[PDB]
Amino acid sequence: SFLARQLGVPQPETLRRYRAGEPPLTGSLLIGGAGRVVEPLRAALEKDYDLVGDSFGGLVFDATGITEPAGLKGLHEFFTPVLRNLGRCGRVVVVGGTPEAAASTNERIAQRALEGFTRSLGKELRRGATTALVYLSPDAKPAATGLESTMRFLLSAKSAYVDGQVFSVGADDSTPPADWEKPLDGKVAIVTGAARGIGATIAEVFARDGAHVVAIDVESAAENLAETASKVGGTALWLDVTADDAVDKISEHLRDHHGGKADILVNNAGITRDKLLANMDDARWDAVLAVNLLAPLRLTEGLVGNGSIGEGGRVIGLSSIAGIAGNRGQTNYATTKAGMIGITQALAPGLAAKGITINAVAPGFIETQMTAAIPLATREVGRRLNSLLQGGQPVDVAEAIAYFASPASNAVTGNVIRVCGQAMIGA
Amino acid sequence: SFLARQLGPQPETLRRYRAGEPPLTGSLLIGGAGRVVEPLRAALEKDYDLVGDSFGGLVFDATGITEPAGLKGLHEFFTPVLRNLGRCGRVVVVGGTPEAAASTNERIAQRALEGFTRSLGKELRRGATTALVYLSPDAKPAATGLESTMRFLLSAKSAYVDGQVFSVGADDSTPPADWEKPLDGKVAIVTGAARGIGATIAEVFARDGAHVVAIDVESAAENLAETASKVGGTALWLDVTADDAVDKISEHLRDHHGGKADILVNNAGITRDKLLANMDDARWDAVLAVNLLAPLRLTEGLVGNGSIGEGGRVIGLSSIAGIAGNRGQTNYATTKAGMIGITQALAPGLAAKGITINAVAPGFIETQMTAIPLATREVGRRLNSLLQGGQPVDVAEAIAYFASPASNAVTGNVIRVCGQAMIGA
Ligand SMILES: NC(=O)C1=CN([C@@H]2O[C@H](COP(=O)(O)OP(=O)(O)OC[C@H]3O[C@@H](n4cnc5c(N)ncnc54)[C@H](O)[C@@H]3O)[C@@H](O)[C@H]2O)C=CC1
Ligand SMILES: NC(=O)C1=CN([C@@H]2O[C@H](COP(=O)(O)OP(=O)(O)OC[C@H]3O[C@@H](n4cnc5c(N)ncnc54)[C@H](O)[C@@H]3O)[C@@H](O)[C@H]2O)C=CC1
Numbered sequence: 001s002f003l004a005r006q007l008g009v010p011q012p013e014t015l016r017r018y019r020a021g022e023p024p025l026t027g028s029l030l031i032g033g034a035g036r037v038v039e040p041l042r043a044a045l046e047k048d049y050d051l052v053g054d055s056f057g058g059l060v061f062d063a064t065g066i067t068e069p070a071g072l073k074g075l076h077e078f079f080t081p082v083l084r085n086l087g088r089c090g091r092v093v094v095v096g097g098t099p100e101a102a103a104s105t106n107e108r109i110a111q112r113a114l115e116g117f118t119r120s121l122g123k124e125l126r127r128g129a130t131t132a133l134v135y136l137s138p139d140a141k142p143a144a145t146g147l148e149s150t151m152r153f154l155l156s157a158k159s160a161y162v163d164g165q166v167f168s169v170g171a172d173d174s175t176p177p178a179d180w181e182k183p184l185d186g187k188v189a190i191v192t193g194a195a196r197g198i199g200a201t202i203a204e205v206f207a208r209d210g211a212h213v214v215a216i217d218v219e220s221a222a223e224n225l226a227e228t229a230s231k232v233g234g235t236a237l238w239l240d241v242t243a244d245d246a247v248d249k250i251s252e253h254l255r256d257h258h259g260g261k262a263d264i265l266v267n268n269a270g271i272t273r274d275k276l277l278a279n280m281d282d283a284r285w286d287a288v289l290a291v292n293l294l295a296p297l298r299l300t301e302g303l304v305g306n307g308s309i310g311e312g313g314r315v316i317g318l319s320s321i322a323g324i325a326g327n328r329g330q331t332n333y334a335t336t337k338a339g340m341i342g343i344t345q346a347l348a349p350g351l352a353a354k355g356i357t358i359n360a361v362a363p364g365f366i367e368t369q370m371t372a373a374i375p376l377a378t379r380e381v382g383r384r385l386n387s388l389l390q391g392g393q394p395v396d397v398a399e400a401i402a403y404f405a406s407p408a409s410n411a412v413t414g415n416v417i418r419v420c421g422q423a424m425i426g427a
Numbered sequence: 428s429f430l431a432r433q434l435g436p437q438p439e440t441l442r443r444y445r446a447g448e449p450p451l452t453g454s455l456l457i458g459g460a461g462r463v464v465e466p467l468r469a470a471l472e473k474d475y476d477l478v479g480d481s482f483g484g485l486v487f488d489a490t491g492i493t494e495p496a497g498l499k500g501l502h503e504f505f506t507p508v509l510r511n512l513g514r515c516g517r518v519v520v521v522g523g524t525p526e527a528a529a530s531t532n533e534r535i536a537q538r539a540l541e542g543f544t545r546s547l548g549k550e551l552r553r554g555a556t557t558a559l560v561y562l563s564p565d566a567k568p569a570a571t572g573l574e575s576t577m578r579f580l581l582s583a584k585s586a587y588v589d590g591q592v593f594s595v596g597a598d599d600s601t602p603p604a605d606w607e608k609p610l611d612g613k614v615a616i617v618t619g620a621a622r623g624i625g626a627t628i629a630e631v632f633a634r635d636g637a638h639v640v641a642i643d644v645e646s647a648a649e650n651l652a653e654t655a656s657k658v659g660g661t662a663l664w665l666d667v668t669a670d671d672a673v674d675k676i677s678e679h680l681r682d683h684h685g686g687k688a689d690i691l692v693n694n695a696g697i698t699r700d701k702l703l704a705n706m707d708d709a710r711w712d713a714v715l716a717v718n719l720l721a722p723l724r725l726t727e728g729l730v731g732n733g734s735i736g737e738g739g740r741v742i743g744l745s746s747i748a749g750i751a752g753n754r755g756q757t758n759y760a761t762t763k764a765g766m767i768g769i770t771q772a773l774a775p776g777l778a779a780k781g782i783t784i785n786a787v788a789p790g791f792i793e794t795q796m797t798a799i800p801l802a803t804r805e806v807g808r809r810l811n812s813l814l815q816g817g818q819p820v821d822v823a824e825a826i827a828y829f830a831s832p833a834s835n836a837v838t839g840n841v842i843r844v845c846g847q848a849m850i851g852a
Contacts, residue, residue: 116749116764
């Protein structure tokens, strides 16, 4: 951070990321509050975590108890004595009940207001710690097994660059993978744009988690794509995702390798043809739409519709901060990454009726060749303009993706998560 | 100094409202295809120069786009005409409510428009702004419920609202007698009105016809009177957090306005900033009671006893902090998020009653609170598409829009007044 003096800004924390074997948090886990979530959670987490009743690894506050605004007082009461003591890369997570689904307008106003609290707290925490807010459906059984994959993601190192965000967990029950640390056992994952960078790193994480990977990219990038299929011990496939036959070409490679079925499609492939709209041509527009919006929509509709992905399936789409906030010279790109959010939202119910979830991740600043292509100052500032005071890592994106792919993340659909370090930019 | 030079700024002097001035600086071009282009042309022919110099406004009807492949319309309409848009120009994309589209394809496409409008907002020059308005696919072709929004957007009043998203329902609208005197013969309770913003809301309201009831605490008795006199409404000393609060206003509505008011503005607000690990009960509880508990207690009270009824208008003051959060403000942002909470939550109940409740989240506004160090002041000021802080009028203008009698199909809305501030969620 070579402009720490120029911007009045702290040296970054080295963010603890996932390592197999290591405990998930670096301290004890406090689970406070009141409502329908504290008891069952204390219960589901007994074994794998380190429950009170030194340094706090995690702090979970149960807000579902809070039925009027006068009760918000709780957040204060619970958090004020314990922040003094949160560890390196701590994890604060507040849990509430889906505000639209509340039993009174009064309840709704308090549960809604939670985000103000969490997004603000995210701005006060030190040494790499983060905040998250999760809403659970008031029609979830009290065991609340549907909430588990999410708590486990946040209450760990994998969520290392996921800060200040809001999770939205449905009503369905969930079933834990035999092994949480190999959650993707014998799953077939399709990952587009997997030659290098974020796509490639998705494949890795997927493989690490148990999946067999179909690495898709174009002929231009074989060698780099070969090196990837190899490393995850999966299978390469040369394909332009915008071409008539693409759906046919994936289905068949599946038929020849995986019994014609898949569990996970990751729409990662993408291009950028930046230019101001006053200077934008038809070609710089169209190309970006084809790859970035038209294709992922086609592959989802294609592969679900032809039965390649069925029950228990998972689609994760690659969005962007640009699609939420906008960006100079990216009206194409940001239409497409906003459309991606639209695919996620538009298809969630339909796919829900088919036992399939669909979610998007919207990366912020990630070290890739592409951030590396930006004038160093503009680049250095961008990298540093977040609560976590640093650029994100391609692993951090893939993690959030892998959390969506989880067989126990079945109750989580239509969600949009930024992997952004709590970047300041937003809508 | 060096960083500033490195990065590359020319804030335009923003045109504001002036009685008499035309509402644009140039002619209005209405393009695109769909159920909005023909009616909008016809509604606006009188007061605007439609295309048979440079463009004062551009409006692209996007309701016509039903699949992603047709997004290309945006590019075909805007690219050619962009280079010709004037100082403080205006760009507005009208679309179909995504959640209510007739296919998932449409939904994808109409949802996609926000990425476009927010980015375009970031490329416009010379103080010009972009806006996205979605209209219920259930509105009648006449589209009468849309006008108030279009007329506010396509005017100088909306000078500091940039890059936003407006949500118009199905209901029909009757226009006021005088578009320049919209609030004529309306009674408006404006809390926190002694100084700054609240005091300016009261002005803009007078300008617009309203009989204002300027409200405040006793300690600010002096400044209230000045305000009350300036606008030609009457004053009321009361602390909004008093258990008698509702009853006192109600009493006053009898004494003066037939036990009746049409608009409520929950402007009164306070701060008490503290890192949460130093937060004491006073600082938590004070703000909470003033910023969240109070506003609700007034709204629910004044609709409950019938003081505000059919045709009513509650407008609450959120904040950027409530959307994006902010260091030292867990208490404060909890409240302003709760204000959105009040707005989203009370909207269907009030809809059924003939009342619209909406919210406004100011960005950075030149005021007496903003007492902030020149290091933080200079950055929050300039970190938005428009390269400056906003004037209080900019905020009150937006409130005045909601408050229109013609804004009956506008409810549940949270509109930031931030000249597209960079910070958000
Ligand atoms: N910092 C970043 O790099 C960020 C990236 N984005 C998005 O994340 C995703 C991955 O990021 P990057 O690694 O930078 O993506 P990228 O632009 O480097 O491309 C990903 C891969 O897609 C492949 N590709 C392009 N067109 C294809 C096609 N028609 N068929 C098959 N493959 C094709 C390319 O060969 C490339 O290897 C992209 O959607 C990108 O837009 C999102 C946020 C930030
Ligand atoms: N940049 C800005 O100015 C921003 C302002 N805010 C909001 O705008 C609103 C007012 O704006 P400002 O003029 O900057 O604040 P302010 O503090 O200058 O407004 C003062 C008014 O609040 C009144 N007040 C405080 N407690 C009261 C009570 N209990 N009962 C009756 N009146 C009471 C004071 O008497 C005074 O009339 C506040 O709600 C604030 O949260 C929103 C975004 C940022």
